[PDB]
Amino acid sequence: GENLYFQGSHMKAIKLTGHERPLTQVKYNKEGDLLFSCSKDSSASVWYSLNGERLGTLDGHTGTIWSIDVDCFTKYCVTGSADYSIKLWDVSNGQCVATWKSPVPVKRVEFSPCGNYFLAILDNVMKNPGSINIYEIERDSATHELTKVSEEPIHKIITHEGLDAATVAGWSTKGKYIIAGHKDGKISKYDVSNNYEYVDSIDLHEKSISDMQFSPDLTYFITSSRDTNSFLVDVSTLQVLKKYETDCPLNTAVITPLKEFIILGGGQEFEARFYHKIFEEEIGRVQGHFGPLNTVAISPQGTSYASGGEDGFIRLHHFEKSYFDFKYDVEKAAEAKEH
């Protein structure tokens, strides 16, 4: 018999096919009109988020692309690859316009909030202890166009005494700190203005940190781990605000704009789970992947999200009316008792 529901759907999904290989990362740009993706293939893809149509591909790398970011102008994106390189690309035409070499695979890249720097995670391999490298891009004030790059990072944060190698990292608000996640499930924080010096760190997970993603304003963040837990954590003091407990090993987590939710995803060799960010309770499960979810991203306006799987597919979701009207009774009391 046919399944019937009291109200309209929470979202509509479409499936993007492009990658013949497991997804490693999806990312929206700032206006949320573009989606960037990378996978175990040697090329990345750029999509329109409105209808899922592929705008083009970024070709040049010779192995897996582990990570992709896009600057705040949507002028350049940056990729880091198993082929031991980092590449900068012009988004308007797909051209590689700078390459940097690494002695080890590069597992994660991310632009600073103002576009002038990016970080790269260099894996530990053999005697290499791993690092977070920071690269500078000098820009034209008018066109935002690249004017100078150097072959060297301007600073290498070498794995710090008593931490395993970093796996994920990103920038806090206005790029004042870098927060890093580690292979031993710790988190640490580096003060950018004081030469990237260590500040503090904390135990958090039992296994390696698998993702870390910030809030819309970069003042707090969410982690996930294959130990099946996720934590909300405040940048300024690194205190734990919230914990989300699942029965599922977690590859990815995000904080939603606009609604007070969290999205988690993972799986064992398949559904994204939504949680209420404040009450720490599961509010839904969104089916559609054929294996584990490897990455999730949400648009900065909070009106769609994408998930990429081990199946090679990206699912793109546009939120409907029942999503934007989803409210606990206490939240309904809060809103109506305003005006």
Partner: protein
């Protein structure tokens, strides 16, 4: 322990945490917090 009063309390303490950070970011780098990307 009223789940409903526990919920009103989590909501209260969240808004407190956010106003606190809000103050400390204003008197600090002149930055105003948000929950959705502004324009």
């Amino acid at each position: 322990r009223d789940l409903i009063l526990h919920q009103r309390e989590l909501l209260k303490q969240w808004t407190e945490y956010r106003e606190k950070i809000g103050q400390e970011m204003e008197k600090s780098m002149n930055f105003k917090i948000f929950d959705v990307q502004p324009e």
